[PDB]
Design an enzyme around this catalytic site. Structure first.
Site, mmCIF file in Angstrom:
data_model
loop_
_atom_site.group_PDB
_atom_site.id
_atom_site.type_symbol
_atom_site.label_atom_id
_atom_site.label_comp_id
_atom_site.label_asym_id
_atom_site.label_seq_id
_atom_site.Cartn_x
_atom_site.Cartn_y
_atom_site.Cartn_z
ATOM 1 N N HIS A 62 1.383 -1.585 0.007
ATOM 2 C CA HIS A 62 0.194 -0.637 -0.255
ATOM 3 C C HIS A 62 0.797 1.721 -0.071
ATOM 4 O O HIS A 62 0.383 2.237 -0.258
ATOM 5 C CB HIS A 62 -1.082 0.378 1.276
ATOM 6 C CG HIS A 62 -1.471 -1.608 1.396
ATOM 7 N ND1 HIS A 62 -1.401 -2.307 2.202
ATOM 8 C CD2 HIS A 62 -2.621 -1.598 1.065
ATOM 9 C CE1 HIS A 62 -1.796 -3.490 2.251
ATOM 10 N NE2 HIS A 62 -3.210 -3.302 1.722
ATOM 11 N N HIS A 92 6.148 7.008 6.481
ATOM 12 C CA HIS A 92 6.126 6.745 5.073
ATOM 13 C C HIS A 92 4.708 6.975 4.637
ATOM 14 O O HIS A 92 4.862 8.543 4.392
ATOM 15 C CB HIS A 92 4.732 5.189 4.945
ATOM 16 C CG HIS A 92 3.206 5.707 5.637
ATOM 17 N ND1 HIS A 92 3.580 5.014 7.013
ATOM 18 C CD2 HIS A 92 2.449 6.188 4.858
ATOM 19 C CE1 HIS A 92 2.536 5.640 7.277
ATOM 20 N NE2 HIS A 92 1.221 6.449 6.520
ATOM 21 N N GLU A 104 -2.593 14.112 1.821
ATOM 22 C CA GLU A 104 -4.408 13.403 1.962
ATOM 23 C C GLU A 104 -5.091 14.738 2.673
ATOM 24 O O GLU A 104 -5.862 14.448 2.800
ATOM 25 C CB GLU A 104 -4.007 11.803 3.216
ATOM 26 C CG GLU A 104 -3.051 10.483 2.503
ATOM 27 C CD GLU A 104 -3.465 9.642 3.304
ATOM 28 O OE1 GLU A 104 -3.053 9.561 4.981
ATOM 29 O OE2 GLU A 104 -3.913 8.838 2.940
ATOM 30 N N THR A 197 -5.669 4.253 7.012
ATOM 31 C CA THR A 197 -5.665 3.202 6.299
ATOM 32 C C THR A 197 -6.076 2.256 6.693
ATOM 33 O O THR A 197 -6.486 2.631 8.064
ATOM 34 C CB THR A 197 -4.572 2.276 6.203
ATOM 35 O OG1 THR A 197 -3.926 2.766 6.739
ATOM 36 C CG2 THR A 197 -3.635 3.337 4.732
HETATM 37 ZN ZN LIG Z 1 -0.257 7.874 6.157
#
Ligand SMILES: [Zn+2]
Length: 258
Positions: A62, A92, A104, A197
């Site tokens: 991912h 990440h 995001e 996530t």
């Molecule tokens: Zn993240």
């Protein structure tokens, strides 16, 4: 089927396997700078990464995580809106297929090319697994990436991506200093949220830095060469692994600056 970022298993489908996706404190969110409340009681952030010990880099399917030794507090985050000590466990990124998207969180609806997440867990809970079950279990430091000049401290990460092209691949990644990824200023916005996530647990105190860091077009291009798939399977480029903004609902975003 397993969750992902595709047309049939993307963010809009997550609620079917993870009902909390429609929760009260989901992330990411759009940060409206004119509605954010300046809080003079917020303390400066305290980032102590001088003793950080990186261990490995892994393609999770991912994203790619750079993991750290969190058996002792060598790399910790404290201060700010936090009470207690939070240990760095991994960092990440989330990025897009184009420079115009990838982050995001958004600022006044503005999207950045990518977003870096430095994940820390509250030491009072003993381990990461226990921490994610608590409302104040994690603290994630979010940093925006804009395309422009190259970031020297990011190159070592970029050069090793070839070795972890597919899902499940990992490589030794020692002596990496995360301080090379921080902006000059530590001014920030903060609000209570969740993991972006699955399992999407609402255990995160988000600390989003106002100052973005710059990376070159070539550096981000290399992120886009990774694969969502495992070796031997049909190639699916790892791009647009970001979740869209969620309703703020009954939450207030606070700012450490005015
Ligand atoms: Zn993240």
């Amino acid at each position: 089927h397993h969750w992902g970022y595709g047309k049939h298993n993307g963010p809009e489908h997550w609620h079917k396997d993870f009902p909390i996706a429609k929760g009260e404190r989901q992330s990411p969110v759009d940060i409206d700078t004119h509605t954010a409340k300046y809080d003079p009681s917020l303390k400066p952030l305290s980032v102590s990464y001088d003793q950080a010990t990186s261990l490995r880099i892994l393609n999770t399917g991912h994203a790619f995580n750079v993991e750290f030794d969190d058996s002792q507090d060598k790399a910790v985050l404290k201060g700010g809106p936090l009470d207690g000590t939070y240990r760095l466990i991994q960092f990440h990124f989330h990025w897009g297929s184009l420079d115009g998207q990838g982050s995001e969180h958004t600022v006044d609806k503005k999207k950045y090319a990518a977003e870096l997440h430095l994940v820390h867990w509250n030491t009072k809970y003993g381990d990461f697994g226990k921490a994610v079950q608590q409302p104040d279990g994690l603290a994630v430091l979010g940093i925006f990436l804009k395309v422009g000049s190259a970031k020297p401290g990011l190159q070592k990460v970029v050069d090793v991506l070839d070795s972890i092209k597919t899902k499940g691949k990992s490589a030794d990644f020692t002596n990496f200093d995360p301080r090379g990824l921080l902006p000059e200023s530590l001014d920030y916005w903060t609000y209570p949220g969740s993991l972006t996530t699955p399992p999407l647990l609402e255990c995160v105190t988000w600390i989003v830095l106002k100052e973005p860091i710059s990376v070159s077009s070539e550096q981000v291009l290399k992120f886009r060469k990774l694969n969502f798939n495992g070796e031997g399977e049909p190639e699916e480029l790892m791009v647009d692994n970001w979740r869209p903004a969620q309703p703020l609902k009954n939450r207030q975003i606070k700012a450490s600056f005015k």
